[PDB]
Amino acid sequence: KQVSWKLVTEYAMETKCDDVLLLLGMYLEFQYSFEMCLKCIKKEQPSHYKYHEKHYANAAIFADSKNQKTICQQAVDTVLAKKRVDSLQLTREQMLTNRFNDLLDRMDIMFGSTGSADIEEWMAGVAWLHCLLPKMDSVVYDFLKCMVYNIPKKRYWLFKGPIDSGKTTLAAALLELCGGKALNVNLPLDRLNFELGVAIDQFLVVFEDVKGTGGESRDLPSGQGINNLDNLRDYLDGSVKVNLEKKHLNKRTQIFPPGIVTMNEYSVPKTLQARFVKQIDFRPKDYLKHCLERSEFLLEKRIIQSGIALLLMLIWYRPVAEFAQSIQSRIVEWKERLDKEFSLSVYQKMKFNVAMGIGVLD
Amino acid sequence: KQVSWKLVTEYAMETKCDDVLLLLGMYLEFQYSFEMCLKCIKKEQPSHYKYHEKHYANAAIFADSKNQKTICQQAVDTVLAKKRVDSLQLTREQMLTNRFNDLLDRMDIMFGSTGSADIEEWMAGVAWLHCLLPKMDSVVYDFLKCMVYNIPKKRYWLFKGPIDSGKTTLAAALLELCGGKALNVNLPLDRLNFELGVAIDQFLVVFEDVKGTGGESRDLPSGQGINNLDNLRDYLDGSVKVNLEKKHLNKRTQIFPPGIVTMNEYSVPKTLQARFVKQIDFRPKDYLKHCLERSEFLLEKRIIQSGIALLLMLIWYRPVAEFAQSIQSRIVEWKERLDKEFSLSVYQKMKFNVAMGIGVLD
Amino acid sequence: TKQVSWKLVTEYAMETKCDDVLLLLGMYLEFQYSFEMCLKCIKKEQPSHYKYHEKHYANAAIFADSKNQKTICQQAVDTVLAKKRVDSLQLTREQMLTNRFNDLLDRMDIMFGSTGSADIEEWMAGVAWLHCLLPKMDSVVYDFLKCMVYNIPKKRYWLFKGPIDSGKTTLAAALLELCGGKALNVNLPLDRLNFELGVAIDQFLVVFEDVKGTGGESRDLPSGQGINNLDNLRDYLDGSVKVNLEKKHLNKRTQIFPPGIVTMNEYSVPKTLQARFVKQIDFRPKDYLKHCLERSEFLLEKRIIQSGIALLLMLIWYRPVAEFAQSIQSRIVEWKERLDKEFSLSVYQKMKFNVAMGIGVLD
Amino acid sequence: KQVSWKLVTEYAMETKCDDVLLLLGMYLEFQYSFEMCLKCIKKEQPSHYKYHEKHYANAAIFADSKNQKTICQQAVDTVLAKKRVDSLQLTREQMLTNRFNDLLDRMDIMFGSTGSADIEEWMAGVAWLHCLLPKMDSVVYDFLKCMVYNIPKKRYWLFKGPIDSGKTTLAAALLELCGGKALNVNLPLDRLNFELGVAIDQFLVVFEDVKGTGGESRDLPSGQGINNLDNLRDYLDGSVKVNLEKKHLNKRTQIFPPGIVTMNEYSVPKTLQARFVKQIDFRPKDYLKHCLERSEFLLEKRIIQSGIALLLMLIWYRPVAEFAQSIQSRIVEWKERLDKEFSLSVYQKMKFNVAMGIGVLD
Amino acid sequence: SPLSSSVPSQKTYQGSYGFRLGFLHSGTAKSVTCTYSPALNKMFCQLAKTCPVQLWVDSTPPPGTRVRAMAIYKQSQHMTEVVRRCPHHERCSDSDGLAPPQHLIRVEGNLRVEYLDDRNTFRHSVVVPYEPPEVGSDCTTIHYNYMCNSSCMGGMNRRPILTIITLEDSSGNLLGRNSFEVRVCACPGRDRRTEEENL
Ligand SMILES: [Zn+2]
Ligand SMILES: [Zn+2]
Ligand SMILES: [Zn+2]
Ligand SMILES: [Zn+2]
């Protein structure tokens, strides 16, 4: 007869879906029967086969409801509601922890029986990324601490280097690791306040490829990005809550999330520079490039750019005592599993290949 | 069957929750059993365990309603309505006292059988702070008499000092003591009228790091910050009520709140320097710096820039009389808690360490 | 089933002329608690509250249980607004000023009454200060009042010009509230001008505050787009034609822009703009006024010398009961007697005496 | 029990009221008893006492209903609906007639048993105005014939001259006479599209005091007015329909209304000049002024600038044939009543005193 | 809160009877309630707690002799200000019935106690009829109680208080006089130890 708003709201939770449309088109997928749901036999997408059967009895009605969009909106709101609470009450560590588990869960599936990801190929990516920076794993750990601590006036890292030098690759992966958003300050300033709003309730934010003024000798186009960042020094400092808007509306006065700031070799003011607690200079390295040429699968499957790879690095390097007490259990469970399939010999060989630039799995 | 909107509002009213998404998520947690509440028997968030029991039966329904979103609105409106009605009828001093009855109300937790803060740590923060500016307790006291009086064209203080000199910290603190908002008058002007509606019903306002001009000689990027304030003379004066407006909602015609301004030693127009009663010049003091290096916890925990810190400093030095009658009671109730928890000699030692450049807790 | 009475709320919004929806929602919610127990009544601190609680106490309870308090408060405000658009389109500018003066005297009765804090002596001490600002002050206030009431095309603005801290503002503010208007800021980008202007809709007068000009770079005065913007609002300052004031993205007003004051520093007032200004007062640094205030701290601290009452008083003191509308003449008299019964002309002179010597008014 | 939406509507139509907030107020007055109302017996408001008794029941009920604003809307839209149907069906001439009628009606009352208008004072205006320009009566007529024919490429008149030349006064009078709107093209070009929308469904438009370039040689500030006009060529032309908007949406595509343009001896482009079918250069005339410095009432009552005055002028001079048949009878009625009121000698005298600059009523 | 023109002296005067003061060495533990530091002439004690002060005389003075107890701020800059209870404490239901709510110093267990509100000096004080050392003891012990922490006026010992014990006859003339500094806190022990520790 009637429909259960609560069930949809709940399904939206177990999926942490904050997109009404997706939520909609997705729940409607439970409309049909499960008894022969081909999307279930093939086990593609857990978001469907893990809940369909359970919500079948409430999706055959939802398909007839006259307020589909209205209902979904409430679920999504609930999802956002949660995020809000878990950003004013949980500890940054607890946040980074909850994040990891979410990643590990994905890994279990992508590396399990139903998955399709080749553990070897990914691990191989771990090696490529480890040849990107001296003591990469430690940097990854260092970054994680930086973000979790969120020490005022010391929250941002600067990635500076020529075109195609890994600045992004690493930045991107880091982001997926902690979970956050990539903002653009190069865009007009009339949409700037709308862009800066994306960074709400976000763990960390990333200003990707910011443009600067000083630097035409290096044949670099001028931009307002850098000059913009300097104006948002209030936001970067992280000392006093800033006001962020959204959808021509007033959302919240929170502390701006910490993050990375990648940019070409442009000039950087003293006031801005001071906001950066750490600066990493990337430089194009032949072998790293020739390695990918013979290791296509590393870019095709977007491995060297995912946080899951970086996680499969902290687990293959960092000691258990470093992870949050809560995840230690699972972490160790992975160090073993990972160990049984990889001898420091095989791995060492992969890093070596990268050095020679002959493809990891070669 | 039907939800008690009145009840939800009663919650938001005791939580001072003026955030539809916050309130939404928070109340929804009450939808669960209070018999086995892990968040209560573990007492982590008062806003939860202190009201779950009472609001349990209600939330139990609120979770099956189809207007959670809406119902929460009204609740916030009420909270907002109150905040307004009060900024018109209660006197300035009756507002600080109302604020303090919230900080001390939070301190009753931080330093309790449920809190998670080391009273010893904070007193140290006070010590550090009390080394930032001569007679700091007096300065903080004067600032209050300057924010409560609200004398036209005499309602703003100016912190003008070099990068990382403590100017922001102190400001950020006072701002939390009196409550308010921090505005960025550095961004463009085409969309700063909303970035001003945030001062609606706020005790004071803070303009964090304002970029001026003519600072080129000091390697300080030019910004339209200082010049933007000048175009708001009637705001900083407080003689006539200006018009603040939020995104297509609440276009209040009130009198701009008083506050502070922090900038990097730029040039101030004689037409603005007159709207600044007192100007404190901050200087980077090495000993304070090193002290922090050995007292990391003062930053990681954000204490030297917390209102609670200064308030404590006040409960420490300032006489009972200075505080309002309706609070003198709860003040002594603390002047004793501290007198007991610490000792004049012990504290002496603290400022001594800070003065020496070593960790406070030695 | 016991429903709510929108009508009763509307009535409250009116008897208090509440135009703020939220502010209304807050005031009516206070009528939710017990009357016999209201501490905010037996103490008498807010007229707007104790004068209607008992009455609205019945409806309040029902209100506090409605699922759309906002709507009700909205329709109650949309009314108070209508009763504004009408009067500002049917009453005589003389009647308005009078009504404004009534609400001004109402806040004056309680103000200096037993159930309120206000030292009648302090204010008169202010009136004295003010009467020392400009020669024949009490007369200036009238010349302005009339000028505002008449509303003569191309003859509706006064240009208060002077340096930093000369009084311009203190006065402009006083006259402002005295008549009931709005302070506008035309210094910020015009890309938001049309909205800032909308604040003038249904107003009696308008006061453009500091309005930065250009050219005064030799005087070390930051140049702005203020004055230049006014010159673009010529027809706005004129008064002949009706302007189109936009507000909240929906144009709901096509009226003649109201008159008012304009303050500024020693900037350059363009030929075309200087014309829209009828009279021009030149304020200057008054050392003795300064010294007096430093010793009469209460004046500034309680915002008297810049209140719509400090001016109305000056009238009740000097001006003849003749110049006032016969629709409130009695009241004006009741006050004149009241003031003399309380003060001595020789005393008031002593006040100005000190204000001239740069000494604390009282004593 | 349920208020009659058709009664509030009817009233609105019988008052050509399109302001929702006004309608509500107007009607809310009829809620009270007419038996003993003041404003209703003092007969000082035509739009009030004429409908109070008819609209009293639907007012005491309306004052109760909860959908007030919603109703008034329905009503106002009906009005706008009518005007919209008139603009597209009625002939431009019929439009002037309906205007004159509503115009005369006002006269009938303001110049009757009830009303503070003084027929003698107004006549003075008719006179004063007749001294403003050579053959003033054959001008107002020439103008009306231009605003009616609305010939393509020959729709605008250009009043050009110094300050206090009467340009506006006449411009305003002509405006009121026909009924249009005053657009300000001096404002920024960004919002230039909103003012133009006010011209939707209007008989004529008036661009008061437009600013141009090249005026420093005469102490005139620069402006974008003139340029902006030269950008709305197809608007002034009246050849092709223009697309105007207002409610944040393309509300209507119509032939922009014809009109007048008043400016101060600025530089006009030949492209904009060939757009003005007629140009009138005004000059400051001492006697006209002194005549006013003695006949203040003319201004303190906005007569010489009123549109009623110009209608009195035509009625006075113009023959009973240049008008519209249907209005002829009423024209005579006003020629006779206007005759028994004054003698050619008196009227003549008036103009004399004007030429002498001493007081039209000396 | 008006100032006083007078300034009661604090000069140590044993008099023609050799008047002194004896204090109960209550050690420097933690649960201390009232102690004395000879090195500091300071008496650390708790709020409203018994404070035994011993009166030592070589020759028992005449009958009708009284002992006055007055308090003044040790620092000259505020020596003109009147020593009284904080705005809060003077509003507490701690009225024994005899002692006025604004008096700092009080007497415990002496029905013949008299509190004086000197209308000329505005000063506050408490007096009691001197009694000869009861058989078994060589001195007369008096129980005092302070009703305000020294933190209510400065915390960091901004306003140090000094108690003045006067020995006067019936008329009210000086016979003997001793004085000691007073500090009302919550840990007389810890506070005495630390301070003495500062040498
Ligand atoms: Zn399925
Ligand atoms: Zn619980
Ligand atoms: Zn009450
Ligand atoms: Zn009537």
Ligand SMILES: [Zn+2]
């Ligand atoms: Zn005390």
